[PDB]
Amino acid sequence: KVFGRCELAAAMKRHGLDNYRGYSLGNWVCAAKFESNFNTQATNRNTDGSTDYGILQINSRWWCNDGRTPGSRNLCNIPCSALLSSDITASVNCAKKIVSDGNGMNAWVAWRNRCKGTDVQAWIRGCRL
Ligand SMILES: [Cl-]
Numbered sequence: 001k002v003f004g005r006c007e008l009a010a011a012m013k014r015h016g017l018d019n020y021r022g023y024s025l026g027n028w029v030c031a032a033k034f035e036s037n038f039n040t041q042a043t044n045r046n047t048d049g050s051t052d053y054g055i056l057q058i059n060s061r062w063w064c065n066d067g068r069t070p071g072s073r074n075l076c077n078i079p080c081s082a083l084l085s086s087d088i089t090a091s092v093n094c095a096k097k098i099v100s101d102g103n104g105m106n107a108w109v110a111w112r113n114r115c116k117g118t119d120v121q122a123w124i125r126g127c128r129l
């Protein structure tokens with residue numbers, strides 16, 4: 001599923017991401033836009049042979065099991081395919097564990113490079129939340 005921008009904003013808000021660990025909603029929409037262009041089916045392979053899944057491009061090196069990343073962890077306790085659902089719940093629950101792990105949203109390279117320090121409130125302007 002390819003979310004619209006306000007549609008995603010509303011789903012994230014319902015799932016408790018607004019101001020989660022101090023990150024306003026616009027941060028999460030911004031990160032999703034640049035990580036996956038709001039497509040829950042996005043996958044991308046990393047150089048080490050891990051893969052990133054879903055609308056927040058969660059990495060199989062640490063966070064989910066895809067059966068093909070030897071020696072990786074599964075800290076979200078989920079198959080990586082669950083991260084590709086049209087239902088964003090599994091991605092949101094796992095993102096919450098990632099952003100809690102000490103490094104905040106710097107775990108998302110696109111967020112660091114394209115959202116951090118910008119006016120992220122522009123990402124939810126005009127949306128009915
Ligand atoms: Cl915001």
Ligand SMILES: [Cl-]
Binds near residue numbers: 109110113
């Ligand atoms: Cl980047």
Ligand code: NA
Binds near residue numbers: 060061064065066074
């Ligand atoms: Na894994």
